[PDB]
């Protein structure tokens, strides 16, 4: 619409795509809660290495445990939809399904506070460079 070909490109709004929304608009929040009892659990092993059978190869004797390893824990929950209730007058299983949602958080610990220490017995230090 001018005297030039004028072939600079143009910018557009992107196409309307079906999007994501939060998990907050279609859930029917309940007022019933249940406890997660996870009574004390034990773990031992040598922090230098896992020790093994010399006869076998995949027969450990103690493992290798230390604080700087990734301490991930996998919990397993029951399904709420299989459960026995006193009441279901609030809940039609034909059209509605049950899901969990955590509310409560705590890390129980069981050790005096204090850190271990190590270092290589054939560490190759050339010289000091502090002074």
């Amino acid at each position: 619409s001018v005297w030039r070909p004028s072939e600079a490109t143009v910018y557009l709004p992107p196409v309307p795509v079906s999007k994501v929304v939060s998990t907050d608009e279609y859930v029917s929040r309940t007022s019933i809660y249940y406890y997660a009892g996870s009574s004390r659990l034990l773990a031992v092993g040598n922090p230098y290495f896992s020790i093994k059978s010399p006869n076998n190869n995949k027969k450990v004797l103690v493992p290798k445990v230390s604080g700087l390893q990734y301490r991930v824990f996998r919990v397993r929950l029951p399904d709420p939809n299989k459960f026995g209730f006193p009441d279901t007058s609030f809940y039609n299983p034909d059209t509605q399904r049950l899901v969990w949602a955590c509310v409560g958080l705590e890390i129980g610990r069981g050790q005096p506070l204090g850190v271990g220490v190590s270092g290589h017995p054939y560490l190759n230090k050339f010289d000091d460079t502090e002074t």
Binding site: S22, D24, L77, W100, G108, L113, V115
Partner: protein, 52 residues
Amino acid sequence: AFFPTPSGSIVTSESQLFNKPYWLQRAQGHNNGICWGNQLFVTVVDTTRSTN
């Protein structure tokens, strides 16, 4: 080829983050607290009580 030695420092009972309740007002994602698959993978890292 110089290299230092890391040290860390004093640890306190106030530097503790555990043995205390938490009540999260709002989770970070669009998922505002809904777990799925009847499982969850919780992780903590503490070297502070790691004396041998």
